[PDB]
Design a protein around this ligand. Structure first.
Ligand SMILES: [Cu+2]
Ligand SMILES: [Cu+2]
Ligand SMILES: [Cu+2]
Ligand SMILES: [Cu+2]
Lengths: 634, 634
């Protein structure tokens, strides 16, 4: 073991992935190993192994140097079998071996996918930090131009970094969707808590349901915000009976595959052969919308499982996205997933052209296409229908008697601008042998803000020390019409900025906290070379980069919304609930390994419920709202 | 001079076009020359030169390593200025110089275009054979896959040759449209007789009008035939008020530019910003259709120019395509051309995506897209409306008293199969310096037939030697329903197979002629390396290369249609008209330089007119029809 070992191995595995490995060890392994000759390394007595082999043998596994979408029911199954081996290894000797043996005869997508999920969930992958997808397989995160510029570099053996690109559209709020950080998170989030997880794999992802509800509600919110800042209007909800108003051209290309199919604007949704009928959604949507409206979800037996309770919204998220936690998957089908594949072939439904899958039929690339947000607004208000059926909250309800926020102040400035980043285009260009490596780079333009700190002034009238949950939302104020909405109109529009638990003493305290300590944030990740340089140094000298092991969050750069240059006033919500009942039972942020989500309040507390008369939020001591102002430096 | 010189120079000029020249001579020229210091080499006292310079100087000329469509009113103008210099050179010292000087600071497309047109039309380019576009700029004629396979070859410096590709469509009659020979011809035909020719350039292309009418009538016919052979039905005529039923994905890529924009099926024609309104066509079409119907074309003054005469159909072709021979271009606009650009941006009319031009906005690539033939059927029956207004032909009309065809026979076997061809992908991949040349090749699958000869047996009942025009059409018989049409239904459907003038001696003769001597055919062209090798062998060893210096025709391989394996019976038409009245006045096939078309009969004689009662064709001695049969070897 070690890690600067485990780590090393990983880096080697995912190095120049589109070509047989150049690391000699990996290849004699790749050749001499037999996953079937010491059914003991395996905790299954190698049933997993024996099942991959069988396929690899009848050679009925997807070919190498071919595309792969995680939405392809077979490609998925294959990818997921590698997971299942790697997964029941007792120690490194068995992982390295397989993710070498297979690495060399299994397709790259299945492989990249398999290795990551495996590293993330398997018992055996603690020490490791995974290189950033963007540099491992750059075709999924880089433009088509820069890609070709990189192939030229290589043809000519002349190095250097190319500048990527992005007045005519709404490819004005593009900086958001096309960011390599969001794209990362978006994929990671669904790697952390995959739709395909069976608790057989080892543990149970806790509230994947609410997690699902919430994560998208926030992309959806975060997204709505940016369009605000751009004189753009909140996003249309997608309907199956209407036209797809805003279509786009991605100008993105597959490594092996071709160029992502484009969609024209004002198109009519076609029945796509092999996935499902347009109507098939319409009905699914109905079945869903009836559970919500009845009060119950009905399983396979005709057993009504009640959802007019706290477990409610997850049971709902199980049927909506359609993970395996689904009660009656034969009835409620899979709205979300199908909706993906469904929106993707819109470029070729009967498939007369044999265009590859589309931007939306992939996690590291969906945020790309505009209907992405159109499709999640729709999912969003499916949930809202349920979320909203609860009776508003009472006074006695929000009140954390004693504790009272006196004041809230921002110790700094809220200022956002446009930084510049560089990732490397090397895994993208093929370098054969005895021809050498030319360093080609890609330079992108991403958003950023300035660290700032919070000065939360507040008195614990209670006799002594109480644990407290510091909940901070950033809601909007006006309409982009100039209509000041109402913490009903705006409660749902708010994006979570931070959530943390601090013990409060008996008396006037002044709790301070930084842009940096935010719980919904993750720093940009270490470069690959960086992770190489570092793996290698430990192994030859004698790696606690327990910075980057889990990381569920969004990019720190994305914390605050972009804003206007003129500036705008947002409304800052500081709600301080009672820590002892919250954490009334138990990372725990990235419960990647079965780790029980620590907060018990539902998600978005306490703005997740109808707020009919603001009269109320306003009279609980432990809730306080102060207006902030964000400015954008050009 | 020489030619094995002129030639050499050319080959050098058009080598690895996408990069500054490696031929030292070309560069000191490229540097030291000044197109403005001996205004004497120029027959204009260099007004041309002084106009390019002015642009090159204010640097308002299109950039290098960028795309270019010949449909772009500016790109065209720029391209066409180079033509105008190269054009008024007195000798080689001035051409070489310029097409060196410019070659290095003008864009490649303008440049390639400029050089060819210039070589083709300028007084000074007799000896020369131009390399095949397909190998000069392979991106416009080669797939998107093979192209990438070639970039890989190059990256790794491992040579190869790749096999190109083409059950779900009508990309079953694809072999026709995607052939590198047709594509060549199509562009050449439009280089030979350009729409932009002003007679200031030096001479007058004779019947560009009828030429235009006809050339497209035959692609259109030839095309209809192939679809026959494929259980496919004759092509729909395109309308501006209907859906674009049948769209395609070209899977083709620009060198500098991106991937050609694709079109979804069942699309509605959008008003495309910058080119023209959909309605703008509709009216044009009307104005056109009213000339035809009135009997006259009305010019700018309100002068009615009659067209119910022989000059008729060309005057019509001048206004329809809209060349500069147009009588009232401000009124009849440019249906054909505009229709090209109009159909191309259908992927991006308001241009929100900034997709490059499309397959149809280029001559070496339009035959690609299915609406290509849909758009020419439409143009086709615009002409037919006029062509058909003439009173049928009388008996006394077709009769070449004396001369009488006794019999007609094919002396071979009519057999068409699928050969294999290889062109080179080198100008496509960038090779910088001190990095050496790897030979990469592309292998295509093209149609072919077997030389066969005609055995035309016929007696001269007259008293002593009459000249004769041997006109041979290949008409269809059955419907693809199995209905069997009527040399009215089928007269227009016939493709020209040969046309030649032979002296018929008095009495029983038996003229024989070959597949090879056909007048509507051209052999595949010499390779580039071949043309290099041969150019090069004749500097050093003190070049005829005469077979390919103009070349209007279609590929010999395309002579006969594809057919069925079962075989089908076509109807062979041998009509022998009177040579002395035909050539009653004067290459002359490729009148590229002002050379008066030799035949005087209108075009398609004598099948261009309504044939109401076959009763007639049937009773002129000098017309004879015999059924042939074509078989396809799988
Ligand atoms: Cu997602
Ligand atoms: Cu989603
Ligand atoms: Cu044409
Ligand atoms: Cu045309």
């Amino acid at each position: 073991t070690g890690n600067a070992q485990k780590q090393q191995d990983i880096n080697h595995l995912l190095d120049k992935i589109y070509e047989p490995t150049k690391y000699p060890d990996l290849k004699d392994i790749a050749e001499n190993f037999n996953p079937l000759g010491d059914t003991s390394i395996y905790n299954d007595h190698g049933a997993a192994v024996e099942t991959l082999m069988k396929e690899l043998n009848d050679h009925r596994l997807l070919e190498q140097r071919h595309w792969y979408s995680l939405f392809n029911t077979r490609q998925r199954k294959e990818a997921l079998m590698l997971f299942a081996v790697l997964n029941q290894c007792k120690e490194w000797y068995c992982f390295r071996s397989n993710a070498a043996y297979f690495r060399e005869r299994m397709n790259e997508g299945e492989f990249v996918y398999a290795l990551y999920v495996s590293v993330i969930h398997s018992k055996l992958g603690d020490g490791i930090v995974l290189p950033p997808l963007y540099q491992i397989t750059p075709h999924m995160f880089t433009n088509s131009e820069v890609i070709d510029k990189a192939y030229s570099a290589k043809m000519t053996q002349k190095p250097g970094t190319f500048n990527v690109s992005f007045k005519n559209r709404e490819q004005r709020v593009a900086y958001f969707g096309e960011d390599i950080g969001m794209n990362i998170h978006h994929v990671t989030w669904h790697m952390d808590f995959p739709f395909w997880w069976e608790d057989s794999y080892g543990y149970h992802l806790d509230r994947k349901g609410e997690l699902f509800f919430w994560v998208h509600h926030q992309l959806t919110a975060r997204f709505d915000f940016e369009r605000l800042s751009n004189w753009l209007d909140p996003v249309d909800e997608l309907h199956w009976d209407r036209i797809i108003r805003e279509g786009f051209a991605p100008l993105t290309s597959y490594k092996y595959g071709g160029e992502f199919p484009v969609r024209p604007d004002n198109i009519h949704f076609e029945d796509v052969d092999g996935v499902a009928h347009v109507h098939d959604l319409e009905i699914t949507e109905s079945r869903i919308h009836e559970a919500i409206d009845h009060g119950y979800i009905t399983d396979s037996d005709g057993h009504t499982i009640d959802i007019r309770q706290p477990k409610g919204i997850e049971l709902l998220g199980d049927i909506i996205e359609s993970s395996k936690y689904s009660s009656n998957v034969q009835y409620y089908g899979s709205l979300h997933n199908t909706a993906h594949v469904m929106l993707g072939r819109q470029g070729d439904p009967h498939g007369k052209f044999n265009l590859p899958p589309g931007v939306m039929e992939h996690f590291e690339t969906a945020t790309r296409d505009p209907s992405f947000f159109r499709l999640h607004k729709y999912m969003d208000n499916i949930f809202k229908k349920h979320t909203d059926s609860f009776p508003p909250y009472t006074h006695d309800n929000l009140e954390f008697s004693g504790m009272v926020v006196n004041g809230v102040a921002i110790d700094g400035e809220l200022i956002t601008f446009f930084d510049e980043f560089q990732y490397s285009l090397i895994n993208a260009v093929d370098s054969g042998e005895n021809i050498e490596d030319v360093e080609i780079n890609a330079r992108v333009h991403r958003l950023n803000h300035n660290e700032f700190t919070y000065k939360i002034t507040m008195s614990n009238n209670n006799d002594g020390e109480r644990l407290a949950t510091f909940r901070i939302f950033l809601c909007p104020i006006e309409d982009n019409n100039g209509i000041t909405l109402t913490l009903d109109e705006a409660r749902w529009f708010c994006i979570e900025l931070d959530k943390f638990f601090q013990k409060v003493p008996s008396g006037p305290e002044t709790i301070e906290r930084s842009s940096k300590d935010s719980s919904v944030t993750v720093p940009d990740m270490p470069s690959f070379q960086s992770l190489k340089e570092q793996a290698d140094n430990a192994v030859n000298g004698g790696l606690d980069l327990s910075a980057y092991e889990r990381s569920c969050g969004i990019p720190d750069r994305m914390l605050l919304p972009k804003s206007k240059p003129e500036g705008m006033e947002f409304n800052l919500y500081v709600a301080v609930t009672d820590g002892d009942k919250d954490t009334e039972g138990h990372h725990a942020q990235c419960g990647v390994h079965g780790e029980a989500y620590p907060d018990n309040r539902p998600l978005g507390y306490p703005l997740e419920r109808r707020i009919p008369d603001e009269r109320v939020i306003d009279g609980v001591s432990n809730i306080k709202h102060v207006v902030v102002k964000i400015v954008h430096h050009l």
